[PDB]
Each structure stands twice: as structure tokens, then as C-alpha cells.
Amino acid sequence: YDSRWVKRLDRLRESKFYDPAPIIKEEEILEADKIHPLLKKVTPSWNSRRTGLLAYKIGMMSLWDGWGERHAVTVCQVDRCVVMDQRTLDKDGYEACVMGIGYKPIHKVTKPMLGVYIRSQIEPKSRIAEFKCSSDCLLPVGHEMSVRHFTPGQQVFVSGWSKDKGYLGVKKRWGFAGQNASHGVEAKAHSSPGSIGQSKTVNVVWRFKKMAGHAGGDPRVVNCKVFRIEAQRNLIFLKGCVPGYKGSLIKISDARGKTHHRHNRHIPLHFPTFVPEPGVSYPVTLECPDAEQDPFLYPEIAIADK
Amino acid sequence: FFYYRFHKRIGKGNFNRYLEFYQKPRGIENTLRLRYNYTPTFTAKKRSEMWKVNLVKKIAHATDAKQVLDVWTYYRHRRTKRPYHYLLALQRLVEVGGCDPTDFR
């Protein structure tokens, strides 16, 4: 809450106050204190669907691969995603799971909200979302989600909000052609929209007409690829691009339709969740398998005129 | 109420190959508040307003918890129930020789 010129100097000076990097291990062992007693393995069915996850956009990065091809990947962090409540047909009328994410100061949370958290036995949350899934994939209350839910090398469905650009013109928003810069052209005609309708035969402008206005701030969805995951820090690297600001909430789910059919067919995935067995170690870091063929192979393409 | 909006939309469902089951549905189709667009007459108003007196009158006349409960039930839809109404019913219920707490009524 400082001044402009104080904030600007802060922005520059922040770099000098960075804590040392953690120490990442090669192996991980879990005990009974991190496992839901109610958690068990369930065989999937033909009409079974899994749950989604929430993430925060951190930033972009470039990473190599086994063949040596560089790719751009976005980093996402699951900020302690925990199940709050469940929905049943008898109780509510539909199967769903409610989850929470984030943290809020106690000096900002209302009493009715704090009542929920007391029951839940969890710290205050910033955001709450819900997922629709099949009845056979209802996770127990209080279970903490992990990055291990998605296996590397599978297609994911990512949803989020776009950025904001304020007010923009017709030429700026849509990308109109306009008029020439010369050859006897009026000032106003430079960036004018031109015809916007028909003659007296149609006295009404059709709905959904492309016009000037505030731009940005819309929902958008995109496909992504799981490139790398981290268990320690709970990090996920997604191949492609994700909308929203560097910190905005984003939803991640499995493939749907063609995406599933074509890609997510031969990939074994833990349907309910990751279920570690007490007394056994697990990897910390998992990488995407390399391709089959050499990417750096330029065969000959015949060019014959006829 | 110059204009009262009310439309019956085509809701989502699956009636194809429907099997006749002798059971009641979830709930009524129409739930929207009914608002008249005209001033009522003297008889209408009277009929609408007589409940306030009839409730008490029948409560008093009642001679058993069954009757009491029935009376109460009949004036279910009757909005704007004053506290004293409850008190009266309670006193009558105790005088009659008790009641059934478990009763839906």
C-alpha cells in the first residue's frame, strides 16, 4: 500500500532478498499419517469418470527432452487442494465432490464461513470449486490431492479465464481491414467500420454484430500435455499455453471425445487416485517418454511436374 | 402487477421407453409465486382474510390432539403467522393430554 515510486523501487530490489533453493531428494517414502483410511482401489467401468484439479499459473519455461528438442511448458502448482464435502442422489440429488484451494487471512473471513472451516478441520480457503464425476469415484472427505493423479504423457483439458485489455476499437478487437492511408481518403474513414446493415428492406441490425467494446475477460479452454511432475513441491509442467494471469485459477481435467479416443486409449491411469502402499518408496520426478522415430530426420520428397 | 410473466419451458428429460411405475413424482411442476393483476372484490378479500379468526375459532373448538393437528395442517399455506398462534396451539395441545412429538404435523 505504498506509493508508486516506492513500489517501483521494491520491484527492482526484491531480487536481493531471495531465500536459498531447497534440497530436492531422489526418493520418497510415505507413512500411515498421510493416507486416508477410507481410501481403497476400485475397478473402473464403462460409465465411470474421474475428478478434476485446480491450479495456479506461475509462468512459462523452456525445457529440452531425450531427443534434444526444446519445448515451451507452463508451470502449475496445486496449492493444497483438499476435498470438503460430497454430494449424493439421496441427500442432494446429484453426485459431485467439492474441493478447496488457497489461503486467506483470518482477519478477512466472515463468521459463517469460519463455521464451515471449523467443521472441516482445515485452514481458511481462498476458492472453492465442484466437480461432477461418477458415483464410483467419490473421494473421501479430507483427502489431499497430489500431482500423481495425472500420468506423464497424457492429454489434459484445461479451462480458464482470458486477460483483460480494456476498451478497444473495431480495428483493434476484431481486426478490421479499414481504408487506405492515401488516395483521397477522409480522416474518419481511416479506421471506420463501413457498412453495418442493409437498406430499408431490413430496418433492424442482426444480433451478435461485430462492434467496438471492452475486450478480454472470457472463458477459454485448451488441450495440454503432461511433460513433467514434481512430488516434493507439487508441481506440474504442461506443454502448450494456458490463459489467465500469472496466478489466476485454472481447472484441469481429462480428455474428452476425440482427444480421448485418439490419445488417451493405451495409457494406464489410476482411476480413483494415487494409492501408495505403506513400506514402499516412490519416485519424486517423472519425465515424459521419448518418441519412437528420430525427430531430426529429413527424408526425401519427390517433386515431379506433370 | 401490470405484467405477470409465466412460461413453461421444455425441460430436459428422458421419456422414451418409459416404464409405468405406480409412484409419485419428485414435486409439482409449477412453483412460481402466483400474483394477481387485478384488485380483489369484497368477497374475495373477506375469504382471504377470514383465516385469522377461523384458525383460533377452530383451535378453541377442537377437543383432541388429532383435531388440533388437523386444524393446524389445514391452514398450512397461510402466511404471516404471529407468535401467539403457536402459544395457543401449544396450550391446547398440553391441555388435551399431550401429543406426538414425532408427528409430521
Partner: peptide, 30 residues
């Protein structure tokens, strides 16, 4: 004169979401 036929403009499947559309939906007892 020459004129390219912009048939792409005729798209009627998998259209993006817009505030106009949203408001249209809303106004219809959303």
C-alpha cells in the same frame, strides 16, 4: 474484378463464447 470467396465466414460449429451471447442467454431466464 477478382474476389475471393470467404467461405470460412460460414462457420456454424464450435464457435467461441462472447459477452453478447452470454447476455442473450441470460435474458432468456438463465
Amino acid at each position: 474484378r477478382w474476389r475471393p470467396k470467404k467461405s470460412y465466414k460460414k462457420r456454424t460449429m464450435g464457435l467461441p463464447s462472447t459477452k453478447a451471447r452470454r447476455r442473450w442467454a441470460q435474458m432468456r431466464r438463465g
